[PDB]
Amino acid sequence: ASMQCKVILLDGSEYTCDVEKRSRGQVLFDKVCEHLNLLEKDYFGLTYRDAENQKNWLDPAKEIKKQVRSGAWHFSFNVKFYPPDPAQLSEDITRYYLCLQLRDDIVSGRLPCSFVTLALLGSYTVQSELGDYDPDECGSDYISEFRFAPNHTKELEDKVIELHKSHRGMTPAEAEMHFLENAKKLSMYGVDLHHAKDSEGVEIMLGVCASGLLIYRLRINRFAWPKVLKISYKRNNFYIKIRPGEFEQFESTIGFKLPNHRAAKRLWKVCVEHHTFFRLL
């Protein structure tokens, strides 16, 4: 009358529990956050891969059964809504799980940034995890475990060490806070990127975040939520209604062709959820 679930956590470890066969996603999410002693859980969710190996958020309001057709109820715990100002989070631990996610986002190449920013962010990670630089605990080899960037230059490594040396006295809470302030200013911070085609058939990327919808073709356009009147899908296609022009005198619907109905439905859902979260709480 129950099914085993496995969840990859942000530090790489694996949470196992059992849930009732007809459990809604909420059941499992609540168990994972309890495990994590996470009170600010609303920023977070669970992803799964479907039979086409596409990533999907587990809808907490719905039976897991209906979403994951396989009995392989394997999930990944992830940031869903990236806070525009992490300093305003109530708890250090929320910020910590947030850093872990952003570290992956960087290493995986999902959040690009300057060599400069990579080294600064790296040095904050090192101060958080290792503490103060010391020539006697720190060979010149003491940061061999850390990944900082999709690609490790021995010069990135030296710059991380240089900056680490300057952070002396800094507590994890502060290393992390500094980490979050440089990270939140990055261009792709918190943007969920989706492949699409525009009306001419030119391949573009439609990003969703706290502030609105982004189009990239090379970043191009950006629609703050306040200016999105309606978000909808039909078939392969994704639509937004906006009031263009200086005085917003008319409505215009802009359309994007997505690779299939399901890609359109995932984009639409993610956009709706972001609008609800960021604009209605």
Swiss-Prot record:
Signal peptide: none annotated. Residues 3-281 form the FERM domain. It comes from the Eukaryota. Expressed at high levels in brain, with lower levels in kidney, intestine, and testis. Detected in lung. It is found in: Cytoplasm, Cytoskeleton; Cell junction; Cell membrane; Cytoplasm. Interacts (via FERM domain) with CADM1. Interacts (via FERM domain) with PRMT3; the interaction is direct and inhibits the protein-arginine N-methyltransferase activity of PRMT3. Interacts with PRMT5. Interacts with PRMT6. Tumor suppressor that inhibits cell proliferation and promotes apoptosis. Modulates the activity of protein arginine N-methyltransferases, including PRMT3 and PRMT5. This is Band 4.1-like protein 3. The lineage of its organism: Eukaryota, Metazoa, Chordata, Craniata, Vertebrata. The gene is EPB41L3. The chain holds residues 109 to 390 of 1087 of the full protein.
